[PDB]
Design a protein around this motif. Structure first.
Motif, mmCIF file in Angstrom:
data_model
loop_
_atom_site.group_PDB
_atom_site.id
_atom_site.type_symbol
_atom_site.label_atom_id
_atom_site.label_comp_id
_atom_site.label_asym_id
_atom_site.label_seq_id
_atom_site.Cartn_x
_atom_site.Cartn_y
_atom_site.Cartn_z
ATOM 1 N N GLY A 293 1.093 -1.116 -0.034
ATOM 2 C CA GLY A 293 0.188 -0.007 -0.394
ATOM 3 C C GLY A 293 0.820 1.289 -0.106
ATOM 4 O O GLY A 293 1.436 1.430 -0.336
ATOM 5 N N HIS A 294 0.613 2.650 -0.163
ATOM 6 C CA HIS A 294 0.929 3.722 0.632
ATOM 7 C C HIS A 294 1.654 3.680 1.542
ATOM 8 O O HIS A 294 2.024 5.075 2.396
ATOM 9 N N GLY A 295 2.414 2.158 2.668
ATOM 10 C CA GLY A 295 3.312 2.524 3.602
ATOM 11 C C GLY A 295 4.050 1.788 3.299
ATOM 12 O O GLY A 295 3.937 0.343 2.942
ATOM 13 N N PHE B 86 -12.392 0.556 0.971
ATOM 14 C CA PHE B 86 -13.446 -1.031 0.923
ATOM 15 C C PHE B 86 -11.916 -1.620 -0.033
ATOM 16 O O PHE B 86 -11.964 -2.904 0.709
ATOM 17 N N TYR B 87 -10.674 -1.253 -0.852
ATOM 18 C CA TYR B 87 -9.594 -1.652 -1.058
ATOM 19 C C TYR B 87 -8.598 -2.230 -0.297
ATOM 20 O O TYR B 87 -8.220 -2.709 -0.262
ATOM 21 N N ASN B 88 -9.092 -1.413 0.956
ATOM 22 C CA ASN B 88 -8.476 -2.094 2.662
ATOM 23 C C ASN B 88 -8.784 -1.317 3.323
ATOM 24 O O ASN B 88 -8.858 -0.993 4.278
ATOM 25 N N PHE C 215 -5.485 -6.338 4.405
ATOM 26 C CA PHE C 215 -6.818 -5.998 3.499
ATOM 27 C C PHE C 215 -6.587 -5.710 1.884
ATOM 28 O O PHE C 215 -7.755 -5.930 1.428
ATOM 29 N N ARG C 216 -5.472 -6.004 1.464
ATOM 30 C CA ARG C 216 -5.073 -5.028 0.553
ATOM 31 C C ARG C 216 -5.008 -5.920 -0.868
ATOM 32 O O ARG C 216 -5.133 -6.490 -1.825
ATOM 33 N N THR C 217 -3.631 -7.094 -0.627
ATOM 34 C CA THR C 217 -2.764 -7.711 -1.339
ATOM 35 C C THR C 217 -4.023 -8.865 -1.532
ATOM 36 O O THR C 217 -4.553 -8.939 -2.583
#
Ligand code: A1I15
Ligand code: A1I15
Ligand code: A1I15
Ligand code: A1I15
Ligand code: FE
Ligand code: FE
Lengths: 347, 346
Positions: A101-103, A295-297, A126-128
């Motif tokens: 993600g963005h981190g 909701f993608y993460n 929650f994303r991959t």
């Protein structure tokens, strides 16, 4: 007492936690399910993505908790903008990071710095791989943040509300499933079209009994498919994700806490009126929808899995209501009142 | 046997040589079938072509002076037609329009002709051009024994229209410009004549425009008040006219004997009228003139193309209605194209 995080790494559970570092701001969503009426009490600092890429949900929490503005921003919206120095001077007693993600990720220097500083690091996801990782992530966060009750309560809620979908879609054979394309941040990227492969919102399509047209076009959870490939495949169902603020006339779908149904549908229509998109069978047949991007993460992703099932099989899920689920979620777990539009149908 | 535009069955004559034109400007459909012998089979016609199309008339007269000797069965209204003069011409077919300046399906003259054993055919280019133009030509082809010419013209028409519709049929409503068409602008007693769901409205629809009067009117033709136009303040203003250059009556000069200068100057008079001149479309220069008689002519593909270029100038940069017009004349007609059938404001 140790635990295995989402990166496979063992983490020793801190005796008491009061200084949580959020590698990605929107990881707050997982934390919010555990902290009850005191959401920001234990956050020492966070990535600026929640404040800058979730302005609507931010504003709602600010009106009830003005102290949110005083939580330090460790960076902007990219892992590379995080100062490791500012991070370490906040003296966190735990750091929560995302596999993607963005981190920062599992191999970042900051993760190693924190290990040298004696600070436990926990990887969630929650994303991959939402399907594999969402519930294990909450179980783990429960243990390391000493909110096992809240976590177990939310897992039961989640499993039950997902089971409402999977009890039906798990028995549907592949040849009866609709083809689906999801265009992430539709209209809002430089190059069309962002989407999800075997992961991210793709997991939601799978669970909801849909057939993701990008499943086998892409190696990763996220990627890009060209407009012409979408037109050619001509999928049964088109879905656009967005989180654009109401009063933004730039291209994008307006969805979130401060968006009315009228603005969500007016702005989805703009997205569906774009050259090429507007000749899709799914658009012409009205099987075109909007879903809130974040909701993608988020472990609130059960709301999206349910919205997907109701778009994939309208009559079989006539009786299912994601708005009731969001309201049960908010009232049981959160400290704010649900507002705005998190999904929309074209008219 | 064939089915006309009134739904009526007509027994096609074995040979036709005495065609009666209920509306003179129905000549336009006939002209596409008769090649270099345009007036050979016309026993008589309504006076609308000669009196309301003086320019196109004069051009045909210079090449065919015998046109002056075709009998006028009336002036410019159905009620001025003598049924007696009609019957003494012993027509072997009568062509009428569902609407216009000539008899309709329920007139007494139509019944008289049925009693006299004369086949009557209803066409339409005026009420429902989109539904009726091509079926009308197909039918005229069959009853006048010019199936080849008709089929040739249909292919030409469909091809030249499809150049527009293949683009505008996919354009969504919210990207379309609002349009008002003022028929015989400046020239009616009470402003402002226009078209609803029909007539030139069909052309606006096809060219991917949004007719502001579509829902203001029940019929193909009607009237909307000046103030209603000002209030709707549409993207694009279009004025129709067919006034002769040397006619001091009010209106837009367009037709076979009109220069671009005369057309531009007379459109400007029309655009300088109180109220009209404050329209956004007029100030922004999205103001145009179209030749009125396209409101009842299978040459209407020329207007549909002119509208499309006005509605989306770049998307139809390469399209040229003057070339469509030239092709039409050379392939089908017996005169040379002259004058100005459309104009843009300076
Ligand atoms: N603003 C940037 N330049 N980067 C943001 C960083 C994360 C990047 N995001 C996406 O690929 C993305 C795609 C669709 C919709 C979104 O909201 C996205 O954020 C990213 O995911 N990087 C991957 C691989 O680089 C990762 O960290 O695993
Ligand atoms: N990995 C990349 N290089 N691009 C994909 C994401 C980067 C950036 N993302 C966002 O702006 C964003 C906004 C709200 C929520 C999110 O999760 C986001 O990632 C992005 O999309 N930039 C555009 C430039 O306009 C682009 O990449 O085309
Ligand atoms: N000179 C007359 N009094 N009437 C003309 C006969 C037809 C009449 N025409 C129009 O209304 C008209 C409107 C705008 C522009 C035109 O060129 C027009 O001819 C008409 O249409 N009558 C209708 C209703 O009777 C019809 O024939 O069905
Ligand atoms: N239905 C009516 N009473 N009037 C409207 C049509 C009749 C007349 N038409 C024309 O002069 C005319 C000229 C060229 C081509 C046409 O198709 C025409 O119809 C008309 O416009 N009368 C005006 C007053 O002149 C009017 O009645 O408002
Ligand atoms: Fe993102
Ligand atoms: Fe008329």
């Amino acid at each position: 007492e140790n635990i295995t995080d989402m990166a496979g790494r063992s983490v020793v559970i801190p005796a008491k936690v009061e200084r949580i570092l959020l590698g990605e701001g929107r990881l707050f969503y997982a934390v919010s399910l555990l902290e009850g009426q005191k959401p920001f009490d234990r956050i020492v600092g966070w990535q600026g993505d929640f404040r800058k890429l979730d302005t609507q949900t931010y504003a709602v929490y600010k009106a009830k908790f003005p102290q949110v503005d005083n939580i330090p921003l460790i960076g902007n919206t990219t892992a590379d903008s995080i100062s490791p120095e500012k991070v370490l001077t906040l003296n966190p007693d735990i750091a929560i990071f995302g596999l993607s993600g963005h981190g920062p990720g599992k191999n970042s220097e900051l993760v190693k710095q924190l290990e040298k500083a004696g600070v436990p690091v926990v990887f969630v996801d929650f994303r991959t791989s939402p399907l594999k990782n969402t519930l294990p992530s909450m179980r783990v966060l429960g243990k390391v943040l000493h909110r096992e009750q809240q976590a177990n309560d939310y897992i039961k809620f989640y499993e039950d509300n997902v089971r409402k979908v999977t009890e039906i879609t798990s028995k549907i054979p592949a040849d009866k499933k609709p083809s689906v394309f999801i265009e992430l941040r539709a209209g809002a990227m430089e190059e069309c079209c962002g989407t999800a492969g075997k992961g991210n919102m793709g997991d939601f399509i799978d669970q909801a009994g849909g057939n993701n047209m990008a499943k086998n076009l892409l190696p990763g959870a996220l990627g890009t498919v060209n407009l012409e490939k979408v037109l050619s495949t001509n999928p049964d169902i088109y879905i656009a994700s967005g989180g654009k603020a109401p009063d933004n006339n730039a291209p994008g779908v307006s969805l979130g806490a401060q968006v009315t149904k009228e603005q969500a549908q007016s702005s989805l229509q703009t997205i569906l009126d774009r050259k090429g998109i507007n000749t899709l069978s799914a658009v012409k047949n009205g099987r075109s929808y909007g879903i809130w991007h974040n909701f993608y993460n988020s472990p609130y992703n059960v709301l999206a899995i349910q919205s997907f099932a109701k778009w994939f099989y309208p009559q079989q899920f006539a009786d299912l209501d994601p708005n009731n689920t969001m309201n049960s979620l908010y009232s049981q777990f959160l400290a704010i009142e649900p507002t705005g539009t998190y999904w929309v149908d074209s008219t």
